């Protein structure tokens, strides 16, 4: 599963 | 209590630079994003950049030469410019705060008109 | 970029109606997906946000479900102040793209 971060912008996965 | 304030005029004038100060409180610009996002009128919301919390940029592809997301931490406050605005650019301009999973809360908007 | 499409623009209700709004995306976003409520005043407030937690403030008649692609905001019990357009947004991979929207509007 992939994500981004809605505060910092750091993303778990592509 | 959250809560973000634009300011910036509504009317820009055709080739003219769109300026909006994003201003906030009670919370941190150090640990929260900005997002800039319009609504143009029948159209969806249209995603245009971030202020992430370490203070590192992000646009749109489409946007990337119109831009500028500058910030003042010790004011509270995220800046707004878009470039040689045309009529296609007619829509509610928003700040909105970003938290880990979405835009928990939103600026009152600015209603954008493009007019000489 | 991930597509986000509300098929349906106008959503015909009536007050007490459960409604459902729907959300496609063009791939599996894994439950990283937030509704918006646009007021006429252009107001905008978060209503949900990974798929089906309810944001602090937000009535309880506001629900969310979905997995993949296909998602749905769903209004039990619907009243006068519910009546705006609805926005879903993918959290998956940037940029954030929304849906066009899902206008309510009265059956009569």
């Known amino acids: 599963d992939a994500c981004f971060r809605h505060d910092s912008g750091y993303e778990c996965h592509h | 209590q959250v809560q973000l304030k634009q300011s910036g005029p509504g009317l820009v004038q055709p080739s003219q630079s769109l300026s909006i100060t994003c201003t906030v409180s009670g919370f941190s610009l150090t640990s929260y994003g900005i997002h800039w996002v319009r609504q143009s009128p029948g159209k969806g919301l249209e995603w245009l950049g971030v202020m992430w919390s370490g203070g590192i940029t992000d646009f749109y592809a489409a946007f990337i030469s119109r831009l500028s997301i500058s910030r003042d931490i010790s004011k509270s406050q995220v800046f707004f410019k878009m470039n040689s605005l045309q009529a296609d650019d007619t829509a509610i301009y928003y700040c909105?705060?970003?938290?880990?999973?979405?835009?928990?809360?939103w600026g009152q908007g600015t209603s954008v008109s493009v007019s000489s | 970029d991930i597509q986000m499409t509300q098929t349906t623009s106008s959503l015909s209700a009536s007050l007490g109606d459960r409604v459902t709004i729907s959300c496609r995306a063009s791939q599996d976003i894994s439950n990283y997906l937030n509704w918006y409520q646009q007021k006429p005043d252009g107001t905008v407030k978060l209503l949900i946000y990974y798929t089906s937690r309810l944001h602090s403030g937000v009535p309880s008649r506001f629900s969310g479900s979905g997995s993949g692609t296909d998602y749905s905001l769903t209004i039990s019990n619907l009243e006068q102040e519910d009546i705006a357009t609805y926005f879903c947004?993918?959290?998956?991979?940037?940029?954030?793209?929304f849906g066009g929207g899902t206008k309510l509007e009265i059956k009569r």
């Open positions: 909105a705060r970003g938290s880990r999973y979405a835009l928990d809360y």
């Open positions: 947004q993918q959290g998956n991979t940037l940029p954030p793209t």
